[PDB]
Design a protein around this nucleic acid. Sequence first.
RNA 1: AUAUACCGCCAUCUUCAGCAAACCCUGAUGAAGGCUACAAAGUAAGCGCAAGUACCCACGUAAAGACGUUAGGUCAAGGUGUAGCC
Lengths: 87, 50, 132, 38, 217
Amino acid sequence: LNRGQIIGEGRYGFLWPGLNVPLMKVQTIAQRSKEEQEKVEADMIQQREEWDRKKKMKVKRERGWSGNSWGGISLGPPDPGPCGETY
Amino acid sequence: LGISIKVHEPPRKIERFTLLQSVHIYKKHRVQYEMRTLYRCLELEHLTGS
Amino acid sequence: KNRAARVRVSKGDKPVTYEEAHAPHYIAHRKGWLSLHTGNLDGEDHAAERTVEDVFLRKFMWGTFPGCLADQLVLKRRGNQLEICAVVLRQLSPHKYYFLVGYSETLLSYFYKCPVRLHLQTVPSKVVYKYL
Amino acid sequence: NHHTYAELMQTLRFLGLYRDEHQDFMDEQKRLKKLRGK
Amino acid sequence: FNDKILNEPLKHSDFFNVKELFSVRSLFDARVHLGHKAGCRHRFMEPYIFGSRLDHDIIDLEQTATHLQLALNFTAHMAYRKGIILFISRNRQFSYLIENMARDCGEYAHTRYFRGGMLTNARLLFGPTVRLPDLIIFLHTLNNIFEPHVAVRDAAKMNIPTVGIVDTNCNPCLITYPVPGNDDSPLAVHLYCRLFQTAITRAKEKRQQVEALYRLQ
RNA sequence: AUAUACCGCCAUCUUCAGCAAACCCUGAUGAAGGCUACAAAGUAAGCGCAAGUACCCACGUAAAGACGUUAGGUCAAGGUGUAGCC
Ligand SMILES: [Mg+2]
Ligand SMILES: [Mg+2]
Ligand SMILES: [Mg+2]
Ligand SMILES: [Mg+2]
Ligand SMILES: [Mg+2]
Ligand SMILES: [Zn+2]
């Protein structure tokens, strides 16, 4: 939920010198236009939807003997020894 | 600064008051909070106003 | 089974700090009161306003310094003066910090008619007391 | 007061200084209700 | 590359000349040949049992001499290769002597309660990097309870070789060098600890001599 | 509207002492089990009992009491999923 909301972002589209702009160079309290906020808002909704469709991305699970059954599922090559002995 | 003082400690007061543990029934199960106040008396004898 | 400030022991991957590893039967024993004001002593007035004011600061500070508080806060009061001890992770840029410092310093002072002084302390990670 | 305590935080969310998580959660779940229902 | 002396006694036979340390006359007065009652006899020890006189096993000492001559060769080689020789017993009669015979040489003993998973779970019982022992001498392969010792299973498990004084009661099948005979007489274990000290104390000084010579060359 | 979606707070067995991650072993490598100090396979961080702490002490009384059971109690402390009305 709290991943794309940067701490510069506001619904009332405003700008600050310390954050949300490239730092200290413009050093005045500016706001966006309503017609500039209309693009950043729909862009953020689009990127949320991008992250949602990446969440709804079907993984290619290999098939051991069946679907929905741990048949010939190959797990990883096993864990090392804590002093060597890679496998 | 040269002031003839004396220090003693008056008795301490605890105000222990009670309230319900649950939100509903089980009135027979309370929980009690106490507030301590510790005093210190700091007499200062024979000094100028300033 | 009382459930007040207990974090419930579940699995060995729960890292907790010192203040929340302890149940509320330890507050004078192994902990300390995080807010420090004179309102609770007896007899003395004006208790309620300062507790509501203090619960406002903890909701305010956990939002405006987002995702970077390690612990809860400490509020100290010395008369017409109140200071805030806060431990903050070293994740955000110090420029971004120093903006939100003075913004808080003047906004909360103009809100509560009192010269506040928020004094932070950096930490790399959240300090772990008990791996439950 | 509870009006100055509320309108200040609402306008500070709008300006972008206060990040109220409960209002972050609530209207997003309202959007998820309005995507299907409503 | 010092790998000449790592293989030079391997080409020899009786490199340390250990056959001078004992004789079958030296075992007979040590009363190695005595055994338990014939009803108290393990089935797998009848290869080494000579016969039975008056319901008493006598161990075939010309077959024990062959076993012990190779067992002493094995422990002398394992002590010349600067390895770890561990002395396991559970008899409680000679546990003072056995810790003495480990402390006289530079090796280790264990004559008390064998904690469970001492050799198999060493990575967790001790720190996670431990040189596990690589030769185990069983002086009494039974417990105080007349059952085979758990370490003769666990050292066979951990792929480390065991020599051991097998008696007429006890299982020889995991003992990689069984040394048949008595173990329950004090003269037996006094000859055994002296023999197992003398076969390894020769080996340590023979390690020192040949390595000092191949520093001289 | 649902405490049979929940958080939050507690009741209870609790006038209990256990619960247990990560290993190791035995059961022909089955569900499982792991006890014998003149000791035969158990080792165990962590939590709890315990110890400390409060009141008048070292005692007592409080406090504490895990993991679980009873889908125990509460959408009416507050918030909140879902369903509903506008
Ligand atoms: Mg299928
Ligand atoms: Mg209770
Ligand atoms: Mg009680
Ligand atoms: Mg206790
Ligand atoms: Mg019910
Ligand atoms: Zn014997």
